Amino acid sequence: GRLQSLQTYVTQQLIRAAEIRASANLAATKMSECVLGQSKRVDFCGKGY
Amino acid sequence: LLQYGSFCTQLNRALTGIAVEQDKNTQEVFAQVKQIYKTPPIKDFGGFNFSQILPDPSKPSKRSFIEDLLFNKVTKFNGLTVLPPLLTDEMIAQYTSALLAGTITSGWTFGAGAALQIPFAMQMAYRFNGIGVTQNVLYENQKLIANQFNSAIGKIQDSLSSTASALGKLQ
Amino acid sequence: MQMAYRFNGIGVTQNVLYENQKLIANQFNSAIGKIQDSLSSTASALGKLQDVVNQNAQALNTLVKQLSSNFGAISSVLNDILSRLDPPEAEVQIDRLITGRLQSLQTYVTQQLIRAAEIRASANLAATKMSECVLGQSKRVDFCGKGYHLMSFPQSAPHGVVFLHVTYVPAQEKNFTTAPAICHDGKAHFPREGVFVSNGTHWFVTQRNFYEPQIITTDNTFVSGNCDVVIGIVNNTVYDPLQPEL
Amino acid sequence: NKKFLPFQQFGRDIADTTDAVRDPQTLEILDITPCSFGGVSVITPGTNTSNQVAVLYQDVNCTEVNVFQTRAGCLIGAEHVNNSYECDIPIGAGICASYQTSQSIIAYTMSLGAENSVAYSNNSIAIPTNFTISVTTEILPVSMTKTSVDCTMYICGDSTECSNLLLQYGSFCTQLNRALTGIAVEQDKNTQEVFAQVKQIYKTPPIKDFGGFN
Ligand SMILES: *[C@@H]1O[C@H](CO)[C@@H](O)[C@H](O)[C@H]1NC(C)=O
């Protein structure tokens, strides 16, 4: 029982980690395109031009 | 547990790979630049007050007011070992310091390698010409832009201090 | 003409292309040689492929090593359990082995599915870079390589692809003193696209990514406003091509 | 320094673990502390380089026993250096290790980069004059090895008693085979979405008049 519970914990940690990695790629792309550069993409860098 | 195979090996490999991926995440976010840049305190910014975003040497923890509000408004032993992070908050604070120094001084031009000094008014004029706004509107309405900018900074300071609704996303 | 179009895409006048064409050719060929050298000798630049391959290999080999695991039963091999126990007596031990091997298979399937999800995420990113960094020109900074982007070239790889980003990097700079505007006769003057620089003698307008002085005139500048509001307007004679041609 | 009630002999923690106690002979409020536990880590360069080994203890200081205590734990077999360099192998808390000065294993704080004070004035501008066409390599993985496992053959290798006991247990082998089949199909969908972009097949003419572009 404890090993099944531990494996469930590991599985959910991997899923949350993958979600966090996708958010991390979003954050790095926004640093490279909203901070380092002036993007023309509408609502990629918040509301407005 | 010896009779129950290699479960411990697989789980520890998975969790160590998780920690390595956390390190890769924070590095690929915050290693945008390799050259640490430093803000000159010479404030000829055309009236653009950057006090709540610049690094403040009045405090030894070298960051701004807003990041300090983000710290102070955001809040077992059976083998459950919390590993330490690789980059501390001070190191990524200095990376944000360098990025703010670059965006003040060189705008986008340090993204192609070396930094290139440009006065900040010309950066704003170029960013207006990027969105089709003719750059005369900047030069003819500079102090109103300074007022609206610094007032918006004060508004987001108050909206972070008196309201913690935009923080539970991290929680 | 494609590289001229790309230089006009990054806001650089295409005369620099036709003036320094063989320099561009020599620098490009040297860059290709540096990449060949850094791929041939330095084999430590392909971690992305072999990490996925070794991860798949570790998962498969762990799934193989699970077979000899006893899982609390009398032995691991089913054949001895069949040859030593009754069909109403082998039920518990074969149930143990089925339970353990089923748990290990579910572990393997969950791991493969999550790893494949991350691989598909990287695949969509790679296909988007194929659609933009190679297939066209992107103004996105640090999306198609470091620096100003021109084009990129793809190459095959086992379970992979390699982009070769042709990038533009400005090299040599010099401290210049500039002003936002020129006052002429009460008429202010703004650059159409550029910046008003003076080497020390006369105000010149130039381009933001290579230094070449244009003589400041109404055919180069934008006449608007007055000589009162602009913080940093300076006095200089804006040239007029009409007066030598009247 | 906790304070029970005069009948309370012990107590649990938030996590339902016996944290603090009171002695059955003597009226005194004790506490149970876990012992020194940690992870054994090894800092080394490659076997194709050397055999010198540095030892890292996780989260605890040098109790059992060069003694270099950091915020990540005990660390012996290394050399503390004031000269902060680039991180080579990460350890924790911004302190990394390397193989430098004849040479041995050192330990140092990660230098965050070459420090620069870029100049600024009211009117000083920096304008490029010469340029460089650098070509930079990116590496992106695309697909994964398509793999199917006959889970009936895996669990029950050439048996029939095992086959009947597996058929008692529903369609788990069917489920795993269907999931792996969907994975294997979406791999080739990835490969077609990456490469199959132009339905034409183009190729160069033999006259490679490319302005001097080898
Ligand atoms: C900017 O605003 C702060 C208040 O947060 C004030 O202390 C500081 O003097 C201001 N600086 C300028 C240049 O206006």
Ligand SMILES: *[C@@H]1O[C@H](CO)[C@@H](O)[C@H](O)[C@H]1NC(C)=O
């Ligand atoms: C420009 O002036 C600054 C002043 O500190 C100096 O550091 C820099 O090297 C100068 N650059 C050139 C190209 O003269």
Ligand SMILES: *[C@@H]1O[C@H](CO)[C@@H](O)[C@H](O)[C@H]1NC(C)=O
């Ligand atoms: C600045 O450029 C003009 C352009 O003709 C030239 O006459 C002058 O000598 C230059 N001054 C210096 C200091 O290079």
Ligand SMILES: *[C@@H]1O[C@H](CO)[C@@H](O)[C@H](O)[C@H]1NC(C)=O
């Ligand atoms: C030069 O800097 C000073 C600040 O010391 C400022 O008052 C002045 O306006 C600047 N010159 C121009 C032309 O803007």
Ligand SMILES: *[C@@H]1O[C@H](CO)[C@@H](O)[C@H](O)[C@H]1NC(C)=O
């Ligand atoms: C520019 O010329 C005007 C005369 O037309 C003069 O009043 C003004 O002071 C000059 N500008 C400077 C900065 O001296």
Ligand SMILES: *[C@@H]1O[C@H](CO)[C@@H](O)[C@H](O)[C@H]1NC(C)=O
């Ligand atoms: C491995 O070590 C040998 C000497 O022990 C050395 O000659 C060789 O270059 C090393 N391998 C690599 C790939 O450098």
Ligand SMILES: *[C@@H]1O[C@H](CO)[C@@H](O)[C@H](O)[C@H]1NC(C)=O
């Ligand atoms: C470890 O650190 C604790 C406090 O952080 C201290 O009380 C203890 O004496 C240290 N032990 C050793 C062996 O350094």
Ligand SMILES: *[C@@H]1O[C@H](CO)[C@@H](O)[C@H](O)[C@H]1NC(C)=O
């Ligand atoms: C590092 O510098 C301090 C003084 O700044 C000195 O006392 C110490 O001995 C140095 N470290 C080593 C390992 O020598």
Ligand SMILES: *[C@@H]1O[C@H](CO)[C@@H](O)[C@H](O)[C@H]1NC(C)=O
């Ligand atoms: C740019 O640098 C290269 C380096 O050799 C040189 O050959 C070339 O003449 C330079 N071009 C300019 C315009 O300075």
Ligand SMILES: *[C@@H]1O[C@H](CO)[C@@H](O)[C@H](O)[C@H]1NC(C)=O
């Ligand atoms: C291109 O480079 C290769 C490798 O150095 C060389 O063999 C070939 O002759 C070159 N061709 C041209 C036309 O540059």
